[PDB]
A paper describes a structure:
Synaptic vesicle glycoprotein 2a (SV2A), a putative membrane transporter in the synaptic vesicles (SVs), has been identified as a target of LEV and BRV. SV2A also serves as a receptor for botulinum neurotoxin (BoNT), which is the most toxic protein and has paradoxically emerged as a potent reagent for therapeutic and cosmetic applications. SV2 family proteins belong to the major facilitator superfamily (MFS) with 12 predicted transmembrane helices. In addition to the transmembrane domain (TMD) core, a cytosolic N-terminal region and a large fourth luminal domain (LD4) are present.
The open edge of the β-strand from the β-hairpin of HCA2 forms backbone hydrogen bonding interactions with the open edge of the C-terminal β-strand from the β-helix structure of LD4A. In addition to the backbone–backbone interaction, the SV2A His578 side chain forms a salt bridge with the BoNT/A2 Glu1156 side chain. SV2A Phe576 contributes to the van der Waals interactions with Ser1142 and Val1144 of BoNT/A2. The protein–protein interaction between HCA2 and LD4A creates a relatively small binding interface with a buried surface area of 464 Å2. To enhance this interaction, N-glycans attached to LD4A contribute to binding. Three putative N-glycan sites, Asn498, Asn548, and Asn573 in SV2A, are mapped on LD4A. A N-glycan containing two N-acetylglucosamines (NAG)s and fucose (FUC) attached to Asn573 forms extensive contacts with HCA2. The BoNT/A2 Phe953 and the aliphatic portion of the BoNT/A2 Arg1064 form the van der Waals contacts with the two NAGs attached to LD4A.
Numbering used by the authors:
A (entry chain B): 876 to 1295
B (entry chain A): 480 to 590
Write the structure that this text describes.
């Protein structure tokens, strides 16, 4: 069902479909270290990806349906040079007819053109004054379905965001060549990242789109806040999804000391551009291998690990006394060689029992392989103290709404720009 | 009181850590570059037509103090009570507020 699908291979980009699309790549196209299947394009002329189809699959029909899907990571817009500056990132237009994908300040645009120069555009708008965004500098699964008979639709992370009728458009003749390059961007320090570009010759329904989203999500591997792979030996700031105005902190170091959620969070501002919340607040959480059999640094599902807490540029260990009063075992930061036999091994979870993808959960365990429970928070006398509890396990068993046991790992990223 | 206000028209401070406690002043047209403001109290002090550019504010207590027609660039407000009502018609660019002090959301006077 897929006609074009750019994937990575041995030091090149190939097309998985049985059409063998020729791909021409500029000398300034970059790749990640860890997920080299994600591609980076910067604002220069040499940052070029050129893919050429065959004549047998050129879109030149009257009522042919088609769809596209890809993942995009768009950095934060920092200044007012970025306003009112729609720039094209994916181009498929020849002779003022075709389809194109463009970006503006806080927008992702899908555009269609016929030979009569009719414009139909479908836009996904995300604000950038929000405290915590799901779209700024984070991976977004964008898929667009076009029904030549009814209307055209844009889907963000599997859900329908906008739709506009395209019945009036009569004939689209797209180009033989597809261009991945920033066009018309006045900011010289601007870039995007894309991955998993696919094309289909039918309008996908919500079922197929959700299937594709789940299949391409790599549910077996944890993801950090930006949507990249989670890695051992790397500092991470911690965000609790249930209470996202507070950041993890400690007050003392030892068995007597505890760690809690302190707030409120700060803010990073550029007047009339962005008024987000500071994400580099609190104590970093390094994750260390304990029993990972994989050679890579990637943290996968059910990987028993250790957790180091960075306090005053010194490393400590996240552990509890399993035998204490109550169900909520309070988490504490200990000297790494003075932990003894306290429960420290954490089982990292990416998906649930049924395999449904969810956020990051940490399951504190003892040396007997017994579940103290999911790591969360519990308020003691108006202090939101970090605990490990089996209550969260009970709600998970009862398919209830767990409160406070889901976490995000926030490393320092260049696309956010906060001053640490 | 308003009769005794001192005015300093035009200033250019650059690379100094600069604390004080000033009362009933107006600064107009200042230009500060890479300055540190640690542990200072401001009573009825008003900054006007100023530029702050990689400045740093730490432990600032503000009593009826305003920044009008002021421009802040790559500045940090750490542990300060300079809330959003003390920047009248200002522009912040890539500025950061951290560990804001507790206080009222409106100017209540500190008599
Ligand atoms: C606003 O900041 C961004 C991000 O830069 C980071 O944050 C700053 C506050 C400061 O701490 C920098 O040292 C940080 O790197 C600036 O955008 C980047 O600027 C750097 C040079 O400083 C440049 O190398 C990058 O390419 C820029 N990245 C992007 C995405 O543009 C931005 O320039 C600052 N705003 C203004 C108006 O200058
Ligand atoms: C703060 O101000 C006082 C008097 O204005 C000065 O003596 C002192 O040195 C200042 N603090 C620092 C850290 O220099
Ligand atoms: C301050 O003066 C006027 C506003 O009264 C304005 O034209 C000018 O640009 C301002 N200066 C700065 C640096 O913002």
């Amino acid at each position: 069902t897929s006609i074009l699908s750019i994937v990575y291979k041995k030091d090149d980009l190939i097309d998985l479909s049985r059409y063998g699309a020729k791909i021409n790549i500029g000398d300034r196209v970059y790749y990640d270290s860890i997920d080299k299947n994600q591609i980076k394009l910067i604002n220069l002329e040499s940052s070029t990806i050129e893919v050429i189809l065959k004549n047998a699959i050129v879109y030149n029909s009257m009522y042919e349906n088609f769809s596209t899907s890809f993942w995009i990571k768009i950095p934060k817009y920092f200044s007012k040079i970025n306003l009112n500056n729609e720039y094209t990132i994916i181009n498929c237009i020849e002779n003022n007819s075709g389809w194109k994908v463009s970006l503006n300040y806080g927008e992702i645009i899908w555009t269609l053109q016929d030979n009569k120069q009719n414009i139909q555009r479908v836009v996904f708008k995300y604000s950038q004054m929000v405290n915590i965004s799901d779209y700024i500098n984070r991976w977004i699964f964008v898929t667009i379905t076009n029904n030549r008979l009814t209307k055209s639709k844009i889907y963000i992370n599997g859900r329908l965001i906008d739709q506009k009728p395209i019945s009036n458009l009569g004939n689209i003749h797209a180009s033989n060549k597809i261009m991945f390059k920033l066009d018309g961007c006045r900011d010289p320090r601007r870039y995007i990242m894309i991955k998993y570009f696919n094309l289909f010759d039918k309008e996908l329904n919500e079922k197929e789109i959700k299937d594709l989203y789940d299949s391409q999500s790599n549910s077996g591997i944890l993801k950090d806040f930006w949507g990249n792979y989670l890695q051992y030996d790397k500092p991470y700031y911690m965000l609790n999804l249930f209470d996202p105005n507070k950041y993890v902190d400690v007050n003392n170091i030892g068995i007597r000391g505890y760690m809690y959620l302190k707030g409120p969070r700060g803010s990073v501002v550029t007047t009339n551009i962005y008024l987000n919340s500071t994400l580099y607040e609190g104590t970093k959480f390094i994750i260390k291998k304990y029993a990972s059999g994989n050679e890579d640094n990637i943290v996968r599902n059910n990987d028993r690990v250790y957790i180091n807490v960075v306090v005053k540029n010194k490393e400590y260990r996240l552990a509890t006394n399993a035998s204490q009063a109550g169900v909520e075992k309070i988490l504490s930061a200990l000297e790494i060689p003075d932990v003894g036999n306290l429960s420290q091994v954490v089982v990292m979870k990416s998906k649930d029992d049924q395999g449904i993808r969810n956020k990051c959960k940490m399951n504190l365990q003892d040396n007997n392989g017994n579940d103290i429970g999911f790591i969360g928070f519990h308020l003691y006398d108006n202090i939101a103290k970090l605990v490990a509890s089996n209550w969260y396990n009970r709600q998970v068993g009862k398919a209830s709404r767990t409160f406070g046991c889901s976490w995000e790992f926030i490393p320092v990223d260049d696309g956010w720009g906060e001053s640490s | 009181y308003a009769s005794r206000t001192k005015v300093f028209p035009g200033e250019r401070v650059e690379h100094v850590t600069f604390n004080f406690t000033l009362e009933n002043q107006i600064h107009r047209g200042g230009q500060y570059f890479n300055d540190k403001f640690i542990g200072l109290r401001l009573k009825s002090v008003s900054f006007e037509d100023s530029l702050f550019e990689e400045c740093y504010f730490e432990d600032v207590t503000s009593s009826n103090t305003f920044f009008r027609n002021c421009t802040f660039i790559n500045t940090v407000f750490y542990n300060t009570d300079l809330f959003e009502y003390k920047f009248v018609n200002s522009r912040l660019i890539n500025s950061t507020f951290l560990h804001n002090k507790e206080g009222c959301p409106l100017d209540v006077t500190g008599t």
